[PDB]
Write an enzyme that holds these catalytic residues in place. Structure first.
Site, PDB file in Angstrom:
ATOM      1  N   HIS A  60      -7.440  18.109 -54.511  1.00 44.99           N
ATOM      2  CA  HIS A  60      -7.198  18.054 -55.935  1.00 44.99           C
ATOM      3  C   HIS A  60      -6.587  19.345 -56.484  1.00 44.99           C
ATOM      4  CE1 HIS A  60     -10.676  20.807 -56.527  1.00 44.99           C
ATOM      5  NE2 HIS A  60     -11.095  20.175 -55.396  1.00 44.99           N
ATOM      6  N   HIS A  63      -6.351  26.619 -53.355  1.00 48.15           N
ATOM      7  CA  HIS A  63      -7.129  27.880 -53.572  1.00 48.15           C
ATOM      8  C   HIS A  63      -6.578  28.981 -52.825  1.00 48.15           C
ATOM      9  CE1 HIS A  63     -11.046  25.373 -54.227  1.00 48.15           C
ATOM     10  NE2 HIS A  63     -10.164  25.275 -55.232  1.00 48.15           N
ATOM     11  N   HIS A  90      -7.422  30.318 -58.404  1.00 49.61           N
ATOM     12  CA  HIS A  90      -6.742  29.022 -58.366  1.00 49.61           C
ATOM     13  C   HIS A  90      -6.216  28.700 -59.730  1.00 49.61           C
ATOM     14  CE1 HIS A  90     -10.976  27.918 -59.450  1.00 49.61           C
ATOM     15  NE2 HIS A  90     -10.337  27.186 -60.308  1.00 49.61           N
ATOM     16  N   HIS A  92      -5.354  25.437 -62.812  1.00 46.88           N
ATOM     17  CA  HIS A  92      -5.441  24.058 -63.262  1.00 46.88           C
ATOM     18  C   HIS A  92      -4.177  23.750 -64.039  1.00 46.88           C
ATOM     19  CE1 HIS A  92      -9.881  23.755 -62.415  1.00 46.88           C
ATOM     20  NE2 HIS A  92      -9.728  25.052 -62.553  1.00 46.88           N
ATOM     21  N   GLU A 102      -7.596  24.286 -69.144  1.00 47.71           N
ATOM     22  CA  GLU A 102      -9.006  23.849 -69.301  1.00 47.71           C
ATOM     23  C   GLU A 102      -9.582  24.271 -70.651  1.00 47.71           C
ATOM     24  OE1 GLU A 102     -10.631  22.169 -65.526  1.00 47.71           O
ATOM     25  OE2 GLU A 102     -11.168  24.283 -65.425  1.00 47.71           O
ATOM     26  N   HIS A 115      -7.683  30.761 -62.908  1.00 48.78           N
ATOM     27  CA  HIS A 115      -9.106  31.175 -62.785  1.00 48.78           C
ATOM     28  C   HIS A 115      -9.192  32.159 -61.656  1.00 48.78           C
ATOM     29  CE1 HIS A 115     -10.620  27.303 -64.869  1.00 48.78           C
ATOM     30  NE2 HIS A 115     -10.154  28.270 -65.655  1.00 48.78           N
ATOM     31  N   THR A 195     -16.169  24.120 -63.703  1.00 48.60           N
ATOM     32  CA  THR A 195     -15.532  22.970 -64.387  1.00 48.60           C
ATOM     33  C   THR A 195     -15.270  21.757 -63.459  1.00 48.60           C
ATOM     34  OG1 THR A 195     -13.313  23.782 -63.983  1.00 48.60           O
ATOM     35  CG2 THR A 195     -14.419  24.546 -65.908  1.00 48.60           C
ATOM     36  N   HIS A 196     -15.835  21.745 -62.230  1.00 53.54           N
ATOM     37  CA  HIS A 196     -15.685  20.661 -61.262  1.00 53.54           C
ATOM     38  C   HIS A 196     -17.069  20.570 -60.647  1.00 53.54           C
ATOM     39  CE1 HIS A 196     -13.094  18.375 -58.061  1.00 53.54           C
ATOM     40  NE2 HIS A 196     -14.102  18.687 -57.249  1.00 53.54           N
TER      41      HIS A 196
HETATM   42  N1  LIG Z   1     -12.826  25.858 -62.285  1.00 49.84           N
HETATM   43  S1  LIG Z   1     -13.980  26.578 -61.364  1.00 49.84           S
HETATM   44  O1  LIG Z   1     -13.791  28.014 -61.206  1.00 49.84           O
HETATM   45  O2  LIG Z   1     -15.292  26.137 -62.007  1.00 49.84           O
HETATM   46  C1  LIG Z   1     -13.881  25.804 -59.738  1.00 49.84           C
HETATM   47  C2  LIG Z   1     -13.339  24.536 -59.531  1.00 49.84           C
HETATM   48  F1  LIG Z   1     -12.807  23.802 -60.517  1.00 49.84           F
HETATM   49  C3  LIG Z   1     -13.292  23.928 -58.316  1.00 49.84           C
HETATM   50  F2  LIG Z   1     -12.718  22.688 -58.302  1.00 49.84           F
HETATM   51  C4  LIG Z   1     -13.743  24.547 -57.162  1.00 49.84           C
HETATM   52  S2  LIG Z   1     -13.662  23.580 -55.669  1.00 49.84           S
HETATM   53  O3  LIG Z   1     -12.180  23.252 -55.506  1.00 49.84           O
HETATM   54  O4  LIG Z   1     -14.148  24.464 -54.506  1.00 49.84           O
HETATM   55  C5  LIG Z   1     -14.617  22.023 -55.659  1.00 49.84           C
HETATM   56  C6  LIG Z   1     -16.138  22.147 -55.630  1.00 49.84           C
HETATM   57  O5  LIG Z   1     -16.595  23.452 -55.832  1.00 49.84           O
HETATM   58  C7  LIG Z   1     -14.328  25.816 -57.294  1.00 49.84           C
HETATM   59  N2  LIG Z   1     -14.871  26.461 -56.132  1.00 49.84           N
HETATM   60  C8  LIG Z   1     -16.165  27.159 -56.108  1.00 49.84           C
HETATM   61  C9  LIG Z   1     -17.299  26.347 -56.777  1.00 49.84           C
HETATM   62  C10 LIG Z   1     -18.635  27.041 -56.475  1.00 49.84           C
HETATM   63  C11 LIG Z   1     -19.663  26.086 -55.836  1.00 49.84           C
HETATM   64  C12 LIG Z   1     -19.947  26.485 -54.384  1.00 49.84           C
HETATM   65  C13 LIG Z   1     -18.686  26.984 -53.669  1.00 49.84           C
HETATM   66  C14 LIG Z   1     -17.981  28.074 -54.504  1.00 49.84           C
HETATM   67  C15 LIG Z   1     -16.511  27.655 -54.682  1.00 49.84           C
HETATM   68  C16 LIG Z   1     -14.410  26.423 -58.564  1.00 49.84           C
HETATM   69  F3  LIG Z   1     -14.931  27.652 -58.730  1.00 49.84           F
HETATM   70 ZN   LIG Z   2     -11.021  26.546 -62.072  1.00 52.15          ZN
END
Ligand SMILES: NS(=O)(=O)c1c(F)c(F)c(S(=O)(=O)CCO)c(NC2CCCCCCC2)c1F
Ligand SMILES: [Zn+2]
Length: 256
Positions: A60, A63, A90, A92, A102, A115, A195-196
């Site tokens: 989706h 990173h 990354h 959005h 976002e 982000h 946010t995911h």
């Molecule tokens: N927008 S955000 O910064 O909240 C965000 C995402 F939107 C997101 F989609 C991801 S993802 O691709 O890895 C999907 C599920 O996490 C992360 N990654 C982090 C989220 C933290 C939870 C544990 C792993 C840390 C990576 C993530 F940080």
């Molecule tokens: Zn993000």
């Protein structure tokens, strides 16, 4: 989990009931309701380009991850008393230029958002320990406004031809993402969430006041990444922004 009508934002509360929580992100920042706080210090970033590690297509989104074995790359200041260690950046974006960020500011939707994510290495020993803690993560959000091409995106955009499909990965090295931040580091801060999924309420948001640019063709490079795996019909990644969420009495603080 993604952004289509069956694995997307509207579907998340089934497995993640925190989706309807009290500290969800992103939010619409209403500038007449912010509170100017003077205990806030300037944000300080110091990132070592040797910590850049790899770029990954995660279906989706994509990173850029950083080595986070030590404190070579850190965020300090702002609302924080602890050092936060850089681990990823990354973006959005949206399906057209008229939305995709976002966060929103007084209802205004930007074309994309950067982000830059960090974890609290003063209190915890790993990203996995920190991820679920209220004080565990710090994310800088930079609104990206369609306009002139941004040349500071070029290493990132050049790298995408190597990671076109879901699961591809490549080394991505010698890159300091502070080069992507705006010249003013004036900011808003509020307590929120990933946010995911898993939508943990573990993020202190740092939203920059100043946007950075992106062109319409740079945006189209992000939308031409593919969410399918290699050999399947190409399915472009058209969008990956979550709607804004209710503030539920939280205060957004302004540094300025
Ligand atoms: N927008 S955000 O910064 O909240 C965000 C995402 F939107 C997101 F989609 C991801 S993802 O691709 O890895 C999907 C599920 O996490 C992360 N990654 C982090 C989220 C933290 C939870 C544990 C792993 C840390 C990576 C993530 F940080
Ligand atoms: Zn993000």
């Amino acid at each position: 989990w993604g952004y289509d009508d069956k694995n997307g934002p509207e579907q998340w509360s089934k497995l993640y009931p925190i989706a309807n929580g009290n500290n969800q992100s992103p939010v619409d920042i209403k500038t007449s309701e912010t509170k100017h706080d003077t205990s806030l210090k300037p944000i300080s970033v110091s990132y070592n380009p040797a910590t850049a590690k790899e770029i990954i297509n995660v279906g989706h989104s994509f990173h850029v991850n950083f080595e986070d074995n030590d404190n070579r790359s850190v965020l300090k200041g702002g609302p924080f008393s602890d050092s936060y260690r850089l681990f990823q950046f990354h973006f959005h974006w949206g399906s057209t230029n008229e939305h995709g960020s976002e966060h929103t500011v007084d209802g205004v939707k930007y074309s994309a958002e950067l982000h830059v994510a960090h974890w609290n290495s003063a209190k915890y020993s790993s990203l996995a320990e920190a991820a679920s803690k209220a004080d565990g993560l710090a994310v800088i959000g930079v609104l990206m406004k369609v306009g002139e091409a941004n040349p500071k995106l070029q290493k990132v955009l050049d790298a995408l031809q190597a990671i076109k499909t879901k699961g591809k990965r490549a080394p991505f090295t010698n890159f300091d993402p502070s080069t992507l931040l705006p010249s003013s580091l004036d900011f808003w801060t509020y307590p929120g969430s990933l946010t995911h999924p898993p939508l943990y309420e573990s993020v202190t948001w740092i939203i920059c006041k100043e946007s950075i640019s992106v062109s319409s063709e740079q945006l189209a490079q992000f939308r031409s990444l593919l969410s399918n795996v290699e050999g399947d019909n190409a399915v472009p990644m058209q969008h990956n922004n979550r709607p804004t969420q209710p503030l539920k009495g939280r205060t957004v603080r302004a540094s300025f």
